[PDB]
Amino acid sequence: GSNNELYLELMKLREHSDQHVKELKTSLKKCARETADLKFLNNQYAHK
Amino acid sequence: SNNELYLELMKLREHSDQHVKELKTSLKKCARETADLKFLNNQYAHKLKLLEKE
């Protein structure tokens, strides 16, 4: 399956890059949530 | 044909890599904002507990 091997390799490279996007997206969501929690406390602190 | 499928997978990979570089930029920017807020909150928390005394 020489044609199959080429398909699997291209699929491998395709998914690896997609998983990297998925990883970075999750990390960005997490950081954005941490920013939200800190800014929430920041607003209650400043309003004193 | 499979060649169209192959070219599709290649195009998907290149778009994802371009998307990766953009995400690394945003993540790096967010990390600084989080660090600034965390540093600012520690000052506010101290200043607030400083006023509670007296």
Numbering used by the authors:
A (entry chain B): 1 to 48
B (entry chain A): 2 to 55
From the paper:
Coiled-coils are important protein–protein interaction motifs present in ∼3% of all eukaryotic proteins.
The first coiled-coil fragment is derived from CEP135, an important protein implicated in centriole formation. The two-stranded parallel coiled-coil fragment encompasses amino acids 82–144 of human CEP135 (referred to as HsCEP135 82–144) that contains one cysteine and one methionine per monomer. Notably, Cys110 of HsCEP135 82–144 is located in a heptad d core position and has been shown to be able to form a disulfide bridge in the context of its two-stranded parallel coiled-coil structure. These results suggest that under the conditions tried, HsCEP135 82–144 does not form a coiled-coil structure. The thermal unfolding profile of HsCEP135 82–144 under oxidizing conditions revealed a cooperative unfolding profile (Tm of 62°C) characteristic of a well-folded protein. Taken together, these results demonstrate that HsCEP135 82–144 only forms a two-stranded coiled-coil under oxidizing buffer conditions, while Kif21a_M947C forms a monomeric antiparallel coiled-coil structure under both reducing and oxidizing buffer conditions. The final structure contains two monomers in the asymmetric unit forming a two-stranded, parallel and in-register coiled-coil structure, consistent with the previous structure solved by molecular replacement. A strong peak for the disulfide bridge formed by the cysteine residues at position 110 is visible in the anomalous difference map as well as the signal contributed by the methionines.
